[PDB]
Amino acid sequence: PNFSGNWKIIRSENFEELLKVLGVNVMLRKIAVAAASKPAVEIKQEGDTFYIKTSTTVRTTEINFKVGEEFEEQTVDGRPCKSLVKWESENKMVCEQKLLKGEGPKTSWTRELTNDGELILTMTADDVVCTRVYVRE
Ligand SMILES: CC1(C)CCC(C)(C)c2nc(C#Cc3ccc(C(=O)O)cc3)cnc21
């Protein structure tokens, strides 16, 4: 089961609502929402080892992880966090995050590969769930 590829977005819901729960300044939220409408997502997968680059004109993130092993990244609001990804099923990985400092809403994410050429990202903050769907470019 192979997440590798260059992905572009087709659907998004609750991205703005997610940033709102995390308390992102309303002006920065409006910029992020604009940027997030047109991302380029590059995934390189070798077994359980992943590289994910999410590029927009405003902000680019790169994460490196191995399913089952602790790593560090940022929350979607830009706060350093400790992360752990596990397989929920053959096609779906789930990630729990803990802030390195401070408190804030409980955040997590999932990535799922469908049988019809889609990649589904969810990102959660307390009980706001953002769902983003991508297809290969
Ligand atoms: C205004 C500024 C610089 C700073 C505030 C935050 C919220 C950190 C920010 N976030 C984004 C984004 C995004 C994004 C795109 C795509 C995806 C995806 O996975 O498709 C996720 C997040 C942009 N700009 C900002």
Side-chain angles (χ1 to χ4, degrees):
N2 199 347
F3 286 72
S4 293
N6 294 287
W7 300 94
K8 70 181 168 175
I9 199 153
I10 59 166
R11 297 167 197 156
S12 172
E13 54 183 44
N14 281 350
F15 186 59
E16 188 158 8
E17 294 304 271
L18 182 78
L19 292 187
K20 189 162 137 128
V21 168
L22 290 169
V24 173
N25 175 275
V26 65
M27 194 178 197
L28 299 190
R29 282 202 314 265
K30 288 182 174 213
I31 296 169
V33 167
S37 68
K38 295 175 164 119
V41 178
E42 184 181 23
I43 305 180
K44 304 172 205 260
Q45 175 189 356
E46 192 74 324
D48 286 333
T49 294
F50 285 82
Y51 167 77
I52 310 182
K53 181 179 183 166
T54 299
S55 303
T56 68
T57 61
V58 313
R59 160 177 179 92
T60 289
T61 68
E62 294 178 280
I63 63 175
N64 289 276
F65 61 92
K66 182 163 188 180
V67 180
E69 295 185 358
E70 219 89 25
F71 66 110
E72 296 191 340
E73 58 174 340
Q74 304 197 336
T75 63
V76 62
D77 59 318
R79 303 177 70 186
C81 66
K82 197 69 181 193
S83 284
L84 177 59
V85 184
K86 299 173 193 161
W87 291 113
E88 172 181 286
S89 72
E90 224 174 85
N91 293 316
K92 185 164 169 170
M93 71 182 69
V94 174
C95 183
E96 285 306 326
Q97 303 181 327
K98 300 174 175 280
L99 289 162
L100 286 185
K101 284 168 280 179
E103 41 277 301
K106 200 197 157 160
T107 64
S108 55
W109 62 255
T110 77
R111 287 182 167 94
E112 177 171 7
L113 197 64
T114 75
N115 70 343
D116 71 339
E118 298 172 350
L119 164 71
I120 305 160
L121 172 64
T122 79
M123 291 179 289
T124 300
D126 285 343
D127 43 33
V128 171
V129 178
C130 171
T131 303
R132 294 165 65 85
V133 184
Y134 310 80
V135 299
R136 287 204 177 70
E137 290 224 65

